[PDB]
Amino acid sequence: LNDLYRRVINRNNRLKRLIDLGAPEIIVNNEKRMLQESVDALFDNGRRGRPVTGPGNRPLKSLSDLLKGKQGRFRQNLLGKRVDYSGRSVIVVGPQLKLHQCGLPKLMALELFKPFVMKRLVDLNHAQNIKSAKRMVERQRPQVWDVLEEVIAEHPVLLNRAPTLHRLGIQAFEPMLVEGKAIQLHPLVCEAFNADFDGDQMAVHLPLSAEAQAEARILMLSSNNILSPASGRPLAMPRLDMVTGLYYLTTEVPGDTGEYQPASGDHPETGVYSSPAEAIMAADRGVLSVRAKIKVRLTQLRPPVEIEAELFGHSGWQPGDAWMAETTLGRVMFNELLPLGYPFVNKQMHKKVQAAIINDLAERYPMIVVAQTVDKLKDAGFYWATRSGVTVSMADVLVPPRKKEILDHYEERADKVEKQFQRGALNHDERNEALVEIWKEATDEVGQALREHYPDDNPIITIVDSGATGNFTQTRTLAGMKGLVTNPKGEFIPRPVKSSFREGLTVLEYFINTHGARKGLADTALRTADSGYLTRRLVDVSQDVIVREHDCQTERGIVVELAERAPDGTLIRDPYIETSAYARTLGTDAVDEAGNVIVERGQDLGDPEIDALLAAGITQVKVRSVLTCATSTGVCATCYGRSMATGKLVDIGEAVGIVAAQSIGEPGTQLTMRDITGGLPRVQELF
Amino acid sequence: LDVNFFDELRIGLATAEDIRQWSYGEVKKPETINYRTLKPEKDGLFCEKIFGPTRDWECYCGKYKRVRFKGIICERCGVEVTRAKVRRERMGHIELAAPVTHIWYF
Amino acid sequence: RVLSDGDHVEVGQQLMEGSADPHEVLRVQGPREVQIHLVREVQEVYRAQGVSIHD
Amino acid sequence: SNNSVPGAPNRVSFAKLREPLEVPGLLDVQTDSFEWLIGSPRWRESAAERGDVNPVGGLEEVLYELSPIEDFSGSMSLSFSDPRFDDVKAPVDECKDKDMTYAAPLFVTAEFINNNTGEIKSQTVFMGDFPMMTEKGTFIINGTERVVVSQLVRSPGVYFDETIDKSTDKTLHSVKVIPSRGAWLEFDVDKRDTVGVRIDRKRRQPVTVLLKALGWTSEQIVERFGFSEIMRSTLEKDNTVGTDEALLDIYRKLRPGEPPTKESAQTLLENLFFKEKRYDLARVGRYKVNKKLGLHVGEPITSSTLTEEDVVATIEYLVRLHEGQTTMTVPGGVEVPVETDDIDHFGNRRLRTVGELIQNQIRVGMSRMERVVRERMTTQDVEAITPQTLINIRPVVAAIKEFFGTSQLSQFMDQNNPLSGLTHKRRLSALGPGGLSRERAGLEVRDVHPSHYGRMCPIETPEGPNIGLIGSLSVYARVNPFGFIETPYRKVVDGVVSDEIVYLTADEEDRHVVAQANSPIDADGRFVEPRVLVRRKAGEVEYVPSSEVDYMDVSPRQMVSVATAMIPFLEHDDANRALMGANMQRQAVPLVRSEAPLVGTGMELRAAIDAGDVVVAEESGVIEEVSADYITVMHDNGTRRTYRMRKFARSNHGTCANQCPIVDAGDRVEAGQVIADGPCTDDGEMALGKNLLVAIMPWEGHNYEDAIILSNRLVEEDVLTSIHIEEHEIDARDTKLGAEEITRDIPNISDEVLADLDERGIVRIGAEVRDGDILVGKVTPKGETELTPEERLLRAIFGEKAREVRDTSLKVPHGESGKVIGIRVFSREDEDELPAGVNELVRVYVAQKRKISDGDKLAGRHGNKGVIGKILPVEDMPFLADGTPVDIILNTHGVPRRMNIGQILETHLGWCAHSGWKVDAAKGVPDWAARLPDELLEAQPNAIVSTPVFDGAQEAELQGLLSCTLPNRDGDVLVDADGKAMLFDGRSGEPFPYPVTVGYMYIMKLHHLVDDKIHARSTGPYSMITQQPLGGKAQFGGQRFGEMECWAMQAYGAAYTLQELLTIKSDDTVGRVKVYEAIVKGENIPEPGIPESFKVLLKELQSLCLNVEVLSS
Amino acid sequence: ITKASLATDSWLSAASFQETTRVLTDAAINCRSDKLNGLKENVIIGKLIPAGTGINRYRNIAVQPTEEARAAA
RNA sequence: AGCGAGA
Ligand SMILES: [Mg+2]
Ligand SMILES: [Zn+2]
Ligand SMILES: [Zn+2]
């Protein structure tokens, strides 16, 4: 930049000399034009004419280029800065940690805390003065480890994982020392970061001020953020391994050892047990399987609603009362992990059911209990997943025995279409579509055959159908037939692939296959770029939507349909009710058959309320929303509705705008597509 | 310096009067630093007489060199003896022989 | 019933297939209808891939 | 019989097919091109074998096109001839050591002629030190190893395209004549029925205007072009009569602002197109125009410049295409089918190899040199000039230097392991000078093209923001003399599949029909079946016309590169995971021991030998004497030769380059035999990893989400460990104040801290050191510094030397430690070739032996990567019924949905290999074993095998082998038929309720070690123009709290912590010391100030004549 | 959304957003004054955001023990 | 400034 200034000064001085000496109009005019061009280049080089070039034939960074673009001063140095007192390392799963904890290697902690540890070891007189203490730490003298354990204690730390797609990308944990160089993360928060242990690098930041430490300890604590700010579904829920372990634990297998049998005339039922403890002690022996139907006399787990209402009815104090439960021992061992007050569930623990349980638990019980229960659940899940006996082997991947007959049956139709085309019956496009349809049908048929061929206890069906991970399309591709493969333009190859990966794809089938995978990988990058830009836009527009008032008392509101009247006469719950009317404040009192009010104005409209409205037979309800909010600045608490994350009404300072925008942007990328747009471009167009 | 009294921020066109009011001098030579002794030139693009002393608390020639001479200007070289960091604060200005038009508005 | 020639239409029924520009619907039906339109469309595109975002 | 080389480990293979052709010389892509550039006798003979009409080297070509040259008047001329190379000025190892570039002098015989009188003055001119290629195929530049990767670029010529016009829904056609450094005319057709030139990207024309500019008449235009209606249309719409008028309009439009004249218009067009000065199509370009338009198919090629014949034929082709004709016949030219062209089709994507790149750079330097010469000729006194004083060589040497250094296609060699170095060669990058950049590159260049089959690997590709632009050559691919990529195919006539192999380019394959390799043959050279799989022109894998398929694929695995060709059971892996596995085969670190895989591929050997990290006997003989450092072998005729090993030399990426002999003192060794292996080689086979006993159980959540748990045995027995060498450099420069000095003369140095240091200020050799320890003791002259009275009083309290010379000594960077392998003292005092200014440059080599630990990244060969969650004691490990503890435990949940069960198959096969088997052929062979090759019904324990990529172990064969798994030591088969065994829990002790898949997997230690990733920062250097401390672990990384992190922070409503971060952690220059003081002394953290970046913004806006003021209120 | 953002009454935020040169030229010609009320602005100049723990009801809470606590002393 | 690479 300095050189540009030199150019300006040279030309100005030469102009001054030219006016002084007395020069022809032509020369002095040209010099004036040159001065104009120099000032132009200085303020903005390259805007008019070719940019002034420097050594190496590159434009000079003009005084304005400092300000614009990604690398301008605004979006590299002002709003985004590098910061001291920070670290970074690879992450390794640690299941032994509590939800509010994270491992932190000794060297990294020592360095990060070097000021504090210096202070403590000077206070402890292990060193005479500050500089002697600094020498003490720089050589890691043996005495400086105990003091380090003293200082780190009760000092929260934030763990970011770039990119921070949403609010839960950065959470505060209580750090704990670990031996070797690797931040030991808690598994249950993996989803919140979307951080999966194959070489992700998670940065660490250290709050200092009392306000910052309070903020990290209170607002940001990992155990304080369970429910998503977007849709409120639990994000610390067990998954992958834990969910499989629990599914194995709580499922029931008829005909197992130690089952219940009510046979009489020769012996008693021989299926009942005095207490759950007895059941575990029997399971230790090779007598009772953990997945057998039995009858246990429970005296410490609350019965479900109907049994409570029958045996006790009014005020059943379960901690002492006893009741006969006909379930599996595994389900009992599960139900001990839930709080005392939660009723007995007695259901197979699909991931869906786990999510429902955690949602209800968070709605009712205080958050700390939710954290403790989730952690116990993780422990049991890992243990029983280890015992679950889920492993993959070629022998466990069973191809369908009817595959060849279906292949012949559908290849016959394919040959028929080939013959019809060879006689000119139809053009290339028509026969391509005909083959596409025939082979898609074949696809569905072999998929059905494979599904019905598998038993239920197979490792692959067990993992997929428990909700743990993966979808049946992947299973069908694994055994059976992969299917139609995408043309690199995007169309469907009418070949198609007819081979299972277990059977092993042929050379040409593989070559055809590569098109789709390469295109998918390419499509990921541009789409995440556009998603990031969209999020930037939405954030800026909503950078000033924050709560200001509790209530504006505005009569205005919107109407939401809820259930639609059936033609036969019935209320079927509208499918998309969980994202429309939930977590909303009623604008007007509900009315039933011109009767009393089921739920009057100003109620959160949580699950019982919607159930009551559906039962009573009302569909349209007027709810308050941000749209019809009377308050000029920002919005009010009531009109906005319930905070999805906190589970209660919003505070008077929440920046709901940023939360909104980030929640819109977060499902980017995972928002895929299959001319009117229908993907992320369509969203962009709408906004 | 600066305080929390930032209640309002204003931007506007800067007239030549304002520009020469900001400036602590008027650079009139295209000389950065001496090739040999590696020091700023007089009236150059790094002139110590304008933007302050390179190393804090002494004038160019060195007549005054310590803190008690704070806010004093040495007669020999004219350097105001103060903190060096002010070099990030003080501006110059070039008095153009002929008027020029700012590109942004063109 | 499929919309066909000779049929009495509404003030908002999409005549043809495909989307409609939000300026037009605003000018026809005021702010509320365009609001409901925009929210419905964005929610649809998100729901089409199975991601749940509260309205 | 693999044969291949004399020394051969008997790795039996599961291959059914027999390769007709051995895998070519994988490094040929570079060495052959460079030999062509030189004009070496080897290249001369090779070209003679296949086109002896015109053997001319790249240099020779440049000189020929350059020579002769004349001035403006033509009174004298200068010419070049006879390029030649002297012996290299130094051997490879020395050139590597002392930084000097492994180069040889280049000589050209000049010849200066004076036309007025008649003389010829000739003498060699010494163009400069050309950089040469070592035998391994890499250049040595400034001591480092550099490789010129091949570039993929669109070939020149005539390309026709058609697009619909949504405005009218009509198919409009356009053509691009793409030259090498030319003009870019285009005959574009718009929706309006008028064909029009767009000459040099300038505002369109009617074609008839141009035609009349060449000298055509309206009747002639009707004669040649009248058949189409658009041509008549544009004729009438032209409203432009007269050749003078046409040339006037064109000249007015081409170079406006200059005075139109009827003399400098013909020259304009003729120079612009029909002169080689500005419009060289090159040889490939002119060949393609001739073939596509069929003008000079019979004639050899020369004079790349065009002819009006060319352009008029182009317009004719375009108009016929718009009409919808199938074929056109030019008068005097073969008929060619009228069709639109592609762009990505490898008949248009050509390879600029090393030879072409260096030749282009030479040509650029030669153009500059000729410009300098031509300029000075006006001022050259006649008869007082000779070539030697006439030729200035500096621009040429400068151009070659600035090429080999900082040119994009001259990349720093990547010797992570022999495979990584090998795969960096054969790497085709689509980006660079004259190529598509990542940003401007679309999404359609990145995808596979059906023409890629056999010429470029669809699998191997970077996963980052580069996928598609960079790929790898197929194994059998061979580069066309014109720069295209040829592939081998067996020709079959009358269904007789002979061994006659022919190399076909993309276009030639497109014309013909090619079968598939694994199409069974009846052993008579004929197809044992009807319905033989086939590919066709448009890239569609379609149903087949049985018989009369003109060609076939030399073998399976023809479409895969060297890296991905080493993945056993590749056909069972999805493209994504195979891509990753190929990528990760290039990140494995060389282990201390290295063990060949039990389960591999035939390529484990060829890759090792062609990687050129392995010593091969040049000629047969008997090993006379072998030692750890050298091997002296007595050849069969008197002479003896000594190969000196390379011991613990540092590679370009800090890895070890150790070589050790494998031949005893009595062995006789034939030529082409391996005599000393390398980093990742074991008895000649590439061994990147280790064979470990593996289980597939989810174990207590420690192997959660592709996290890996290891036996401590792997640490104790030291089966996973890497040597890492890092060099630290320090120079005694000269300053105005004085000069630095490298010696024990240091200020304020403790006795101990100076103990390690030798008298010369160099740490003692082979000494253990730690972060911060003085590697080399250096002190810089302090000049003059104003001291502090408090320091003066202190110095008096101690009554010691105040001292002046400032202390700046080479110290171990933070987080490093190890042994001092070597110290090199290159000094100006020793008269070393130090760069101007440094008086003594010392390099210290520090090596550390890194063992496996949490955070390190392992992975198999099927994209099954992961960091190590934990390393359990061997006792609490699942151990088989026999008491053998497993080594690793991967997670089951990762297998199905990642769709890479190849690993599982490998696992099974690995166990079968480790245990050894014996097929019970008591009553004939079992049906499933009928097709198994002989010598596979039996295999001793720990017998290595190979499954070729697309022709290997069929799952039925795996089942059968897994059934017969002869017992380990006593009578007990630990793994059942299914491949799963019963495993005892190490911790509880009870056996696991269900059997668990157990086997042997070949996994690797990837070069992403945690020690190089861990980093921390409390306070350190800060950037210059702004604060916000310096980023990067290299300096002292301050972790970027970017924008999305600010958003997340706001969303929590967490405001004070945000302000703290962005103000006093990052920028605020006054608060920062204050918070440090508060922390040290235990006071409340002060109030944040204004970040120092806002003020720089204020000053910059003010500097733009924008009066910005902060009003108080 | 873009237009709505660029129509805010804060030039320091619009400039931070996009198309810097034009927005600054416009704001300069209008002698526009930014009141520093949004979030991006408060971030840029490094004072406390007016959201969450930064608004004027929590930012200035007065905290003291109870008279019973003073009695405990 | 340029290269290559991880997530
Ligand atoms: Mg990852
Ligand atoms: Zn409201
Ligand atoms: Zn002075």
Side-chain angles (χ1 to χ4, degrees), chain A residues 11-17 19 31-32 35, chain B residues 94-100:
Chain A
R11 296 212 208 161
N12 181 36
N13 279 13
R14 190 187 306 137
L15 179 63
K16 174 74 69 57
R17 303 311 162 291
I19 82 167
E31 180 57 27
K32 284 217 199 78
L35 178 66
Chain B
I94 307 162
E95 172 43 276
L96 296 177
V100 73

Side-chain angles (χ1 to χ4, degrees), chain A residues 3-40:
Chain A
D3 159 79
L4 294 160
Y5 264 67
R6 202 194 189 216
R7 182 182 326 294
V8 165
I9 296 165
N10 303 315
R11 296 212 208 161
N12 181 36
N13 279 13
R14 190 187 306 137
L15 179 63
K16 174 74 69 57
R17 303 311 162 291
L18 273 158
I19 82 167
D20 186 68
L21 309 163
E25 171 279 344
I26 294 287
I27 298 171
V28 65
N29 157 10
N30 192 26
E31 180 57 27
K32 284 217 199 78
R33 182 206 293 115
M34 260 165 277
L35 178 66
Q36 170 62 70
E37 196 283 338
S38 50
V39 174
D40 160 8

Side-chain angles (χ1 to χ4, degrees), chain A residues 404 407-408 411 414-415 418 439 494-496 498 506 508-509, chain D residues 515-516 518-520 527-536 541 543-549:
Chain A
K404 176 26 55 202
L407 291 203
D408 289 334
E411 272 219 291
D415 317 308
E418 196 282 340
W439 287 115
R495 172 56 275 144
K498 302 187 295 181
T506 47
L508 275 161
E509 284 165 349
Chain D
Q516 181 177 357
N518 54 24
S519 49
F527 302 84
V528 47
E529 80 278 15
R531 200 264 191 272
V532 289
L533 196 38
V534 157
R535 264 189 305 133
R536 321 197 202 197
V541 186
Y543 192 70
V544 310
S546 310
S547 174
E548 277 290 3
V549 299

